[model samples]
Target: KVFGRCELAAAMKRHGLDNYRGYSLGNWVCAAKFESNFNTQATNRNTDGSTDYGILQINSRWWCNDGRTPGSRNLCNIPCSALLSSDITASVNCAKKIVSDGNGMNAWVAWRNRCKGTDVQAWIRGCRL
Candidate 1:
């Protein structure tokens, strides 16, 4: 659902990314693809310790909060709809803010152009990242 198709694509459109080329995805997509195939419901092996949950691989160890009381829940975690909220820019901006806060970060600020070179991901729709 997070592979820039359907809801993810719609979300990207909201972020003014009607033509996103996927290069801005950077290592984030690589890791996510290797780990979850873009499926948000992914769960990892417990032995890995780094086995996190959700689309963004939110680690239970760090995302836990005081309000996580029993039944009453907060589904604001990554991979949840918050990541695909009606406002896509808000969601991405939220991620950027989190990364900017010094938490473990993985981001790409530049767009992938047509010039072929090292690590240059291709444009599937004539769109630049």
Candidate 2:
């Protein structure tokens, strides 16, 4: 599933991502834009030999277990393929745990490089949340 900007914001808000870990819905939406363009099927392989999965690009190294990462911790305790679900519940829950681990949005390099410390209002503006 590929979501439009406002669509992604609304859906993420539905999952309580609006203010999860002191980050606003705009922040999450902005990260989604850069991370996966709101596509549920998105995946990227890292040079470190781990793969990122789904809209938020949850990593196989730390968040999910693909059974292929050799020694992945899978702290989120879910199969990496689960992150690709269009429902996004698994993805959202995993992310909440990631932030709870004190990584905050910094867990995602794309969020750090793109959404962090930036004006993210545009990501949720006119959404009428």
Candidate 3:
């Protein structure tokens, strides 16, 4: 896992998400903070039978395959396990694709539940990036 929030922001910036979809980097940081608390291996099974994977909690119903579970579109063509890594390359790429697909951060329930319409500037507070 990364040592701090700045590292996560830097990685997201390098992945071209610093100002993606008219959303600030702070939005992404806040979503990540609430989604998984910056832990890469985070996973949560939704009540609807799909599971959330990785720091951004991409859902398996449309984003990736969870192997034994059914009803995965796997639009990103990656295994959900790939997103559970500390490296975060696959997760970032998949997230970029998700945003590019026009869903933006709205694809994440965490963003909708915890980040939307909130004051997110503190997510980047004290970070030098």
Candidate 4:
């Protein structure tokens, strides 16, 4: 696990995630919780034979190369393994690109399913970022 909610909030702020693409701290924190439980090494296999990587659960199909998958767009231009590191710089940067590509946080289905329309203030309640 890379960080708890509060620490992740602070780190995200340090990395400038507070207002990225108009996404609030609560939204990012809540998405992180549901996506990978803040674990940088987290990976989930999809039914379509793709995988999600890191705390944001970015897809291998379009975001990064998994090597096992051929013809990957690798939009982030980083290896999928890089996203699994404790240093989240690459992961965060890739996520910013994803957001800027007009997907916003909607690129993460977990955000749509859980964080959307929810009272997510509690996700950052005690965080002193």
Using TM-score as the measure, the top candidate is 2
lDDT of 1 by residue, 14-120 (tens): 55433233324333443334444556655553443433444444443334222333332223344333433334443454444444545234331211121224252
Q: Each candidate: what lDDT?
A: 0.39, 0.90, 0.85, 0.89
The per-residue C-alpha lDDT of model 2 at residue 18 equals 86
**Tens-digit lDDT string for candidate 4 (1-129):** 578889888878889888899989899899999999999899999887889999899999899998876666899999999999998888889989998997688889999999988988889997776
Root-mean-square deviation of every model: 7.8, 0.9, 1.6, 1.0
Stretch of 10 with least lDDT, candidate 1: 107-116
| Candidate 2 residue lDDT tens string, 10-125 | 88899999899899999999988899999999999999999999999999988899988977788888999999998989999998998888779998889999998899988898
Which of 1 and 3 is the better model by TM-score?
3
Clashes of 4: 0
Model number with the top lDDT: 2
Score residue 113 of candidate 4 by CA lDDT.
Answer: 97
Segments in model 2 whose C-alpha atoms lie over 4 Å from true places: none
TM-score of each: 0.43, 0.96, 0.90, 0.95
lDDT of 3: 0.85
Error of 3 at 94 (Å): 1.1
Task: Report the error of model 1 at residue 28, Å.
Answer: 3.6
How does candidate 1 fare on TM-score? Answer: 0.43
lDDT sort, best first: 2, 4, 3, 1
